[PDB]
Amino acid sequence: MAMQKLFTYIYEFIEYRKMVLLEEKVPYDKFVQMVLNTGFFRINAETLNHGIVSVFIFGANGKYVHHGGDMRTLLTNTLNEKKHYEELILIVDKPVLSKKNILDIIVEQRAANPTIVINIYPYHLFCINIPKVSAIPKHKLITQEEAQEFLGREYLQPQDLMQISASDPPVVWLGGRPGDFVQIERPSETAMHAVVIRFITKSKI
Amino acid sequence: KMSSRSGNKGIAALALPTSDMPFTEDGLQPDLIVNPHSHPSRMTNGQMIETTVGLANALQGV
Amino acid sequence: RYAVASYGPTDALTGQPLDGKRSHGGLRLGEMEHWVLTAQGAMQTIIEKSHDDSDGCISYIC
Amino acid sequence: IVESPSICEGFVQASSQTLVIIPDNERITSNVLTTFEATRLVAVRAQQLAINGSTMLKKKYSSPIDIAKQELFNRKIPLLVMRCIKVTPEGQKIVEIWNPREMGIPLLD
Amino acid sequence: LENPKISTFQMNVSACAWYNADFDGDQMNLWVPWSVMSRVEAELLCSVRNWFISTKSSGPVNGQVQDSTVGSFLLTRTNTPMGKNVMNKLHAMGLFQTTQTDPPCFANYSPTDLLDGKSVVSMLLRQTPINYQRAPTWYSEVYAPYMHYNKQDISTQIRNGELIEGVLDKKAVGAGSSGGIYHLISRRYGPQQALKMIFATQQLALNYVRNAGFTVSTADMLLTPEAHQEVQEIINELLLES
Amino acid sequence: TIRGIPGIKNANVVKLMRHRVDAQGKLVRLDNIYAIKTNGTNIFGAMLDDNIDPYTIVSSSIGDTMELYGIEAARQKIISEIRTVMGDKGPNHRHLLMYADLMTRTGQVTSLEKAGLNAREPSNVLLRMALSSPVQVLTDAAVDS
Amino acid sequence: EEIEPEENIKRVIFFLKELSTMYSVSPVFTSGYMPLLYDLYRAGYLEVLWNPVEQKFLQHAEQREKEQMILQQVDMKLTEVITQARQYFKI
Amino acid sequence: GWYCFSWPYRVDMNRFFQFYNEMPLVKTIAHNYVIPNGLNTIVAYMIYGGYNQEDSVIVSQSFIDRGGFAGTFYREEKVELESDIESFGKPDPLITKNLKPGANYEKLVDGFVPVGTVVKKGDI
Amino acid sequence: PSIMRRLPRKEGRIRKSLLGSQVWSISRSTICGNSDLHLDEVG
Amino acid sequence: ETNGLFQMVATGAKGSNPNMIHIMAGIGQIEINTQRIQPQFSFGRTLVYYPRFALEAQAYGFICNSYIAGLTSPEFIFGEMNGRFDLINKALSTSSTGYANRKAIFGLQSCIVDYYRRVSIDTRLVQQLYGEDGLDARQLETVRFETIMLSDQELEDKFKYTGIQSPLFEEEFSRLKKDRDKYRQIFLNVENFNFSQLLTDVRQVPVNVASIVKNILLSSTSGVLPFDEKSILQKYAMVKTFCKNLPYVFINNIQERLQTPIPVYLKRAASLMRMLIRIELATVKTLNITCEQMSAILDLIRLQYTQSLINYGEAVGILAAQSVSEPLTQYMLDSHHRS
């Protein structure tokens, strides 16, 4: 029942990022029909700075995840359009993450476009409202100035803090990029709660 | 280090003279004084039964 | 039982005391004891035992 | 072309450092000696008394350890605690200088 | 130890909890610091009083073990098989002749005056008055149906060092007992002061047994013939269900 | 797969106790709460089920919690799992944080073995030499300068 | 840059000033009052802060110093006697 | 116990021969084939001063003096020679080199200490 | 016998000569019970 | 009243209830790895003394006899099967624990508390604050929190002061109420991502604030104080200011005088101490305390709070490894009581 969870929590994820939808919503049956016919479903949103985020949801048995050429031509056709792109979210089945060729096209597209963030994610990262999970503490991106003040007070460097990957699910939902700082408020059985600051690093794919 | 036949080993800790050891009304006094707390956790019941049987054997001469 | 000295037979290679009572050497302050002394913060004790009393010397480095 | 090694690289001796003392009003470390610091102070003073023996303690004791303890307790110990805060890549060594004559002693006697 | 025939490292039994040691044949190392620097740090940092409270479980490490746990119960017990648990002035003073603390004042007592174990324990806890009120290990609802518990032995209450009622056992004076008597003394008066009271209360427990006695025998383990028939009748029910 | 979710071989029913704030603000213990304790772990499999609350899925697997929830939830999972092993006569809570905070300081759950030490502390050769195999570490240190 | 303590701490520092010639205590003037707190805790008498019964502890400290001096002098006399006797026996 | 019936004919290392042994008052079938080793000590199961805590025992000193668990313990010294280099004999201070500090060479008789004398620490 | 064989195992250079140590001025003996000694005292 | 064996077990000196039952009543079922004696003797026989596919419970380790009555040959063999496991697991409790202990220390030993009470590896933070509270394990007190289990009506019955009609005491109860909600919200969430970790109104705090108030009240000769409006208002201001400056315990007295901004992670460290102080120094609980006695309580609270702080340069990585690898000896000892 993955696709049903995606159909609701991808829009919950878009809302959580404070992005405005561009294309009007469609029923779930039409969504699965498009996923079956075309092989993928495409959602568009615009950021406060008018940056365009396009999220691709790929079927498990689609041609774009088995043939590298299909993914290559799809990404090439999407990346040369007259829109203010800032990120492409490629939601695929988890085994697709293990396919070396697909990741090869992904990294080649990253190299060809140094100003566009290309990310590939499994289904399970968008099947719950991740911030609402009880086991997950409260993450919050902090500005560069606040982090600089904190490090100056503590005589610390960004490389000295704890580090968290940009592919970390709450970091993905926040929208953190490598080089940013995330403040985490977490429960504690000693001081009843604690606050830490982590330095976001590069994603694992 | 000394031990009984039930596996309750021990280390000689104190050496008392013949007038400092406890004695019965009939004059019997121990050679070794072992803690009663050595038994309940190790359940060396054969050592306690041996003392009961051996106590009657001495008087009966058997 | 054992108690040796401030000095005695020494290993040729490491400069440390010999092993055990049989060789008239010292006793071992092993790996786990430096863990405890470090945990307690006993660093001047480690200098006294692991350096002054075992093999401590002076190394000259340019 | 990355060429053969030169003399600019390959230095083993680290460059000298400049001791940067944090001003008293801008200090962050506690105004209370830790048990480690108090023990180190007493041990150092006792060893130095075993070497020199010159002290300004008004009372008389027959052991360097007791004299060092009373000197620490009477706030007459000629030592300072330098708390190394950070060694900066440019060369500076930011430290904290604390006077044990105006800090709380954690020991008991 | 000035005796030339002694070759062992002797220590108090309540100190075994630090080392997880016992006297079945264990051997322990011992080195005396000689350097002034190492001798200073041994007194200030590595003293065993610094680890009365465990750095692992945040609770006390030491207490009464195996003779002052049952000895304290007998001393603080309300009723003896030979009547009320009291003692004359002469035997009340004899309990304090080994604690190595300053003796209390027994001047306000006739030779025929009787003192109970609670009064004797109180004279020692006045030095470090604490507040304690829990249920002793003696009381257990498992034993309750088949026992007649004394209502003055199932509620151990101490206020300002005065043992008002109850018995002292593993719950109050036992080793590793969090919130116990010696845990409260350490928090209020220092871990060194708690160690002296462990030794001091150990002597009253042992001095009480010097003429009260404690033993285990084979008949202490023997069911009556009527109760043996009840045990196998219970087991036969298990084998019937099986 | 027929009539089930992959990864779990047995699913029992257990009674567990929870607190809940009443309408009068009182915190009360609720003892009549039934849940499912399974043998085998699949967070994503039980995630998709409509009969299970997805927000309060408690796994015993650090790797599975790390995969789906993150490093912060994996940090809380290491603390919980060590405490279960430690029983009740266990260490203070601050000693369990030291394990989890060390093992999760790099954004991934490192181990307490040679591979884990090489990730947290790659440049500490002498400590790495002492742990497992000095010859292998010494050879690699020389070539890497 | 402290300027002036409070009346409670004023009388406490007066107590410490009077006790300095009597116990191993030296009063300081830190703003945080903390070395004073450690000195009072170490002296085993923190009751000055709320209970005006400082005089009995002053007398206690005087007494304890008196027995300390008496025992010290007794030990010095004993050890000099021992030294002279050992010298006599060695000769 | 009686570790060997031919102990005087043997030069053994780290062997103890306990003088007195008793058949248990409650014996078993194993004592039909091996000699019992021990004594029927009178044992009191009591708390006496707290010196028998934590698996310790309190021993009567009189029982010790009378021979309870008393015996003789043996050690051996087997020294070999190098053929025609070394020899057995008492060294002399004015010829031999690096004699052991704090030694006692005067107890040697023709290279060996005579039988029956008490040798203590430092004696050659 | 080789130079690198001295390093690895428990009886090796690192774990026996560096992380551990043989020391002087130390004593060992069997321990015993003594109820007249304080908890911070050793016979 | 006279049984030596029972008094040793009942008082906790030595032994337990299964020990007396085994001695006197019966050993019962021998259970290895939470199961009966499996048949390893030729396809369905547990021993040579029982037939193949035996149905009686005695054939599978059920010892019907007690130690005082003696065991039979088959019962002694089954007892030896379980007894041998104790010897085997005791041997493993040394080597297996040692393998895990050494690996834990070599990974954790580099963690040392620096001058900020952080835990770091020579530059690299492992903890922003040691234990997230900055305290020592040897300096902790187990203290109950009153407000946690109370309903909102009885929270107002016990902690709302109605003697003075001032807006200040409305904020005092509101701060008491929302500290109660914050404790509930956090620790109910902790209950959610655990198997059987229930909420408790009992915490380990460095200072037992209730005892200090109780101690001073006893030693004070003042009895029931008369009603004074300014003294009650002054005490509330003293407590509110003390809780505001409480995080300065982690820095020094110099910054407290200068009132420099406190880092966020240090404000969270003193959250439990702030909560307990406002519970035990509520206006209802300090009615018979003078303003001068209140200063003594505040001075004594931060004296004990500073004494419980972790030391600079303490090898806490070795402390944690020793504290965690030690219970593994008992965990390994109970290997035959687990599946």
Shortest CA gap E146–chain D (Å): 52
Q: Which two tokens stand for residue D63?
A: 């052991």
| Residue F71: alpha-carbon gap to chain centroid | 9
Q: Are J133 and A192 in contact (CB under 8 A)?
A: no
Chain J contact set for A183 (CB, 8 A): 264
State the amino acid at position A63 in one-letter form: K
Tell me the shortest Cα–Cα distance from D70 to chain G, in angstroms: 6
Q: Which pair of tokens denotes residue J97?
A: 């624990």
Q: What is the DSSP pairing of strand E131-134 with strand E156-159?
A: antiparallel
Check if C30 contacts J (Cβ < 8 Å): no
| Cross-strand bridge partners of residue H74 | H15
C15 at I interface, C-beta within 8 A: no
Q: Residue H57: its chain I contacts at CB < 8 A?
A: none
What's the residue count for chain F?
145
**Largest Cα–Cα distance of chain C, in whole Å?**
46
Task: Tally DSSP H helices, then E strands, for chain H.
Answer: 1, 4
Query: Taking the C-alpha atoms of H7, H11, H16 and H22 in order, what is their torsion angle to the nearest 10 degrees?
Result: 0
Residue owning tokens 């780290």: H14
H and E touch with 3+ CB pairs <8 Å, answer yes
**Parallel, antiparallel, or unpaired for β D92-98 and D18-21?**
parallel
Q: How far apart, in Å, are the Cα atoms of F136 and each of A150, J88, J103, J109? A: 41, 35, 18, 22
Give me the sign of the Cα torsion angle A161, A165, A170, A171. Answer: positive
Q: Which chain F residue has its CA at the smallest distance from J125's CA?
A: F105
Please answer whether residues E136 and E167 qualify as being in contact, where contact means their C-beta atoms are separated by less than 8 angstroms.
Answer: yes
- Provide residues of H within 8 Å CB-CB of chain I: 49-54, 56
The full 3-state SS of A150-203, as one line of letters, equals HHHHHCCCCCCCEEEECCCHHHHHHCCCCCCEEEEEECCCCCCCEEEEEEEECC
Taking only Cα atoms into account, the Rg of chain F, rounded to an integer number of angstroms, comes to: 21
d(CA E49, CA E43): 10
* Burial label, E21 (beta-carbon count in 10 A; 0-12, 13-18, 19+): middle
Work out the burial of residue B39: count CB atoms within 10 Å of its CB; fewer than 13 is exposed, 13-18 middle, 19 or more buried: buried
Q: How far is CA E159 from CA E77, E173, H43, J63, J239, in A?
A: 18, 16, 43, 49, 29
Question: In Å, how far is D92's CA from the nearest CA of chain E?
Answer: 32
C-beta separation of H4 from H16 below 8 A: no
Alpha helical stretches, state H, J1-53: 4-10, 17-20
Binding-site residues on chain A for chain F (CB distance < 8 A)? 1-2, 5, 123-125, 127-128, 130, 132-137, 139, 162-165, 168-171, 184, 186-187, 189-190, 198, 201
Give the Cβ contact number of residue J282 at 10 Å.
22
- Chain J environment of B41 (Cβ under 8 Å): 14-15, 19
Long-range contacts of J245-250 (CB under 8 A, 24+ apart): J246/J270, J246/J273, J246/J274, J246/J277, J246/J302, J246/J305, J249/J302, J249/J305, J249/J306, J249/J309, J250/J117, J250/J134, J250/J309
- Active site (catalytic) residues of H: 55
**Strand ranges for chain E from DSSP E:** 9-11, 27-30, 79-80, 83-84, 86-88, 114-116, 131-134, 156-159, 162-165
Quickly count: other Cβ atoms within 10 Å of residue J189's Cβ: 17
Contacts of A184 in chain J (CB under 8 A): none
Distance in angstroms (rounded) separating the CA atoms of residues A78 and A82: 10
Distance CA F91, CA E73 (A): 30
CA distance G85 to chain J (A): 50
- Closest-CA distance of chain F to residue A104, Å: 22
Using a CB-CB cut-off of 8 Å, the residues of chain A touching F70 are 136, 164, 168-171
Interface of C with J in 31-50 (CB under 8 A): 31, 35-36, 38-39, 41
Structure tokens at E227: 């109760």
Residue of I nearest to B11 (CA): I32
Q: Which of E154, E81, E96, E85 is nearest to E118 (CA)?
A: E85
H95, burial (CB in 10 Å: exposed 0-12, middle 13-18, buried 19+): exposed
Q: How was this structure determined?
A: cryo-EM
CB contact under 8 A, D31 and G32: yes
Dist CA J123 CA A155 (whole Å): 10
Nearest CA-CA distance, residue F87 and chain E, Å: 12
Amino acid in position G25? V
Would you say D72 and D99 are in contact if contact means Cβ atoms under 8 Å apart? no
Using an 8 Å Cβ cutoff, are A57 and A90 in contact?
Answer: no
The rounded distance, in Å, linking the Cα atoms of E99 and E103 is 9
Mind giving me the DSSP string for chain F?
--SS-TT-SEEEEEEEEEEEE-TTS-EEEEEEEEEEEEES--HHHHHS-SSS-GGG---S-HHHHHHHT-HHHHHHHHHHHHHHHH-SS---HHHHHHHHHHHTTTSS---SSHHHHHHH-TT-HHHHHHHT-HHHHHHHHHHH-
Q: Do chains B and I touch by CB distance (3+ pairs < 8 Å)?
A: yes
- Report CA torsion sign: D64, D67, D72, D73: positive
Chains H and D touch (3+ CB pairs under 8 A): no
Q: How is the beta sheet containing J112-113 ordered, strand by strand?
A: J112-113, J119-121, J124-127
- Measure the CA–CA gap between J36 and A199, rounded to whole angstroms: 54
- Closest among D92, D95, D78 to D29, alpha carbons compared: D95
Q: Looking at CA atoms only, how far is residue F7 from chain E in angstroms?
A: 36
Residue among A164, I26, E11 nearest F107 (CA)? A164
For chains C and E, what is the number of CB pairs under 8 angstroms?
31
User: Which residues of chain H have a CB within 8 Å of the CB of B9?
Assistant: 55
The backbone region for E213, taken as left when phi is positive above 0, alpha when psi lies in -120 to 50, beta otherwise, is left
- For chains D and G, CB pairs below 8 A equal 40
B13/I34 touch (CB, cutoff 8 Å), yes or no: yes
Q: How many residues are given for chain H?
A: 124
Can you tell me which residue has the tokens 């403040």? A183
Question: Does any CB of chain E come closer than 8 Å to the CB of residue F37?
Answer: no
Buried b (16+ CB within 10 A) or exposed e, D72-97: bbbbebebebebebbeeeeeebbbbe
Q: Are J129 and J118 a contacting pair, CB within 8 Å?
A: yes
Residue from D27, D83, D86, D93 to probe the interface with A (highest A Cβ count within 10 Å): D86
Beta bridge partners of E60: E53
Q: How far is A195 from chain D, CA to nearest CA, in Å?
A: 20
Query: How many DSSP H helices and E strands does chain A contain?
Result: 8, 9
Residue-by-residue DSSP string for D32-70: B--HHHHHHHHHHHHHHHHHT-----SS--SSHHHHHHH
Gap between the Cα atoms of A156 and D94, Å rounded:
13
CB nearest A195 (choices: J131, J183, J268): J268
CB F13 within 8 A of CB F34: yes
Q: Are H6 and H33 in contact (CB under 8 A)?
A: no
Which residues touch E208 (CB under 8 Å, ≥6 apart)?
E71, E74, E75, E95, E117
Separation of alpha carbons A73 and A63, rounded Å: 12
- What's the DSSP call for residue J336? G
Residue type at position F30:
L
Distances in Å between the Cα of J248 and the Cα atoms of D85, G2, J118, J245, J278 are 19, 17, 16, 6, 17
Pairwise CA distance, residues F72 & F7, whole Å? 24
Q: Which residues in chain F are contacts of J132 at CB distance < 8 A?
A: 94, 97
- Beta-carbon contacts of J74 under 8 Å, excluding residues fewer than 6 positions away, are J47, J49, J50, J58, J59
Cβ–Cβ gap H45/E13 under 8 Å: no
Distance CA B17, CA H58 (A): 11
In whole angstroms, give the CA distance from residue J90 to residue F48. 45
| CA angle J194–J200–J201, rounded 5-degree value | 150
Q: Under an 8 A CB cutoff, do B41 and J14 touch?
A: yes
3-state secondary structure F107-145: CCCCCCCHHHHHHHCCCCHHHHHHHCCHHHHHHHHHHHC
Q: CA–CA distance from J184 to each of A24, A134, F26, J205 (Å)?
A: 42, 14, 11, 17
CB I40 within 8 A of CB E16: no
Neighbours of H25 (CB within 10 A): 15
Q: Which residues pair with A201 in a beta bridge?
A: A165
Q: Does E31 touch chain I (CB under 8 A)?
A: yes
Strand order in the sheet with E162-165: E131-134, E156-159, E162-165
Q: Which chains share 3+ C-beta pairs under 8 angstroms with I?
A: B, C, E, F, H
> How many cross-chain Cβ pairs, H to I, lie less than 8 Å apart?
12
Chain C CB contacts of I27 under 8 Å are: 1-4, 27
- Residues D32 and J303 sit within 8 Å (Cβ to Cβ): no
Asked if residue J109 lies in contact with residue J317, where contact means CB atoms within 8 angstroms, the answer is: yes
The CA–CA distances, whole Å, from C40 to E48, E138, J311 equal 11, 38, 11
Considering only CB atoms, C44 lies closest to which of E8, E31, E38, namely: E38
The sign of the torsion formed by the CA atoms of E167, E173, E176, E182 equals positive
Distance of residue E145 Cα from the nearest chain H Cα, in angstroms: 30
Q: Which residue has the tokens 């007398």?
A: G59
Which stretches of chain J are DSSP H helices?
4-10, 17-20, 73-108, 152-159, 167-192, 209-219, 229-244, 253-258, 264-269, 271-280, 291-307, 316-325, 328-333
Give me the helices (H) in E48-111, please: 68-76, 89-93
- Chain H within 8 Å of E206 (Cβ-Cβ)? yes
Q: Hunting for tokens 């903390």 — which residue is that?
A: G34
Residues 6 or more apart from J158 whose CB is under 8 A from it? J146, J150, J284
Report how far residue A53's alpha carbon sits from residue A88's, in angstroms, rounded to the nearest whole number. Answer: 6
**3+ Cβ–Cβ pairs closer than 8 Å linking F and J:** yes
Q: Residue I9 in contact with residue E15, Cβ under 8 Å? A: no
**How buried is A101 (Cβ within 10 angstroms: 0-12 exposed, 13-18 middle, 19+ buried)?**
middle
* C-alpha span between J130 and D28 (Å, rounded): 17
Coil, helix or strand for B3? strand
CB-count exposure of residue H82 (10 Å: 0-12, 13-18, 19+): exposed
Among chain B residues, the shortest Cα distance to I32 is held by B13
Residues of chain G positioned with their CB less than 8 A from the CB of D73: 24-26, 42
Q: Rounded to an integer, what distance in angstroms lies between the CA atom of residue I34 and that of residue E12? A: 5
Alpha carbon distance D72, D64 (integer Å): 12
Question: Which residue of I32, I37, I40 to mutate against E (max E Cβ within 10 Å)?
Answer: I40
E37 vs D contacts (CB less than 8 Å): 43-44, 46-47
Q: Which of residues 57-116 of J touch D (CB under 8 A)?
A: 115-116
CA J85, CA J336: separation in Å to the nearest integer? 7
Token pair for residue J300?
């004594």
Residue with tokens 């048995």: A61
CA dihedral A193, A195, A200, A204 (to 10 degrees): -20
Region of H17 please: left (phi>0), alpha (psi -120 to 50) or beta: beta
Q: Is the distance from CB of E234 to CB of J19 less than 8 angstroms?
A: no
> Which of J244, J284, J291 minimizes the C-alpha distance to J146?
J284
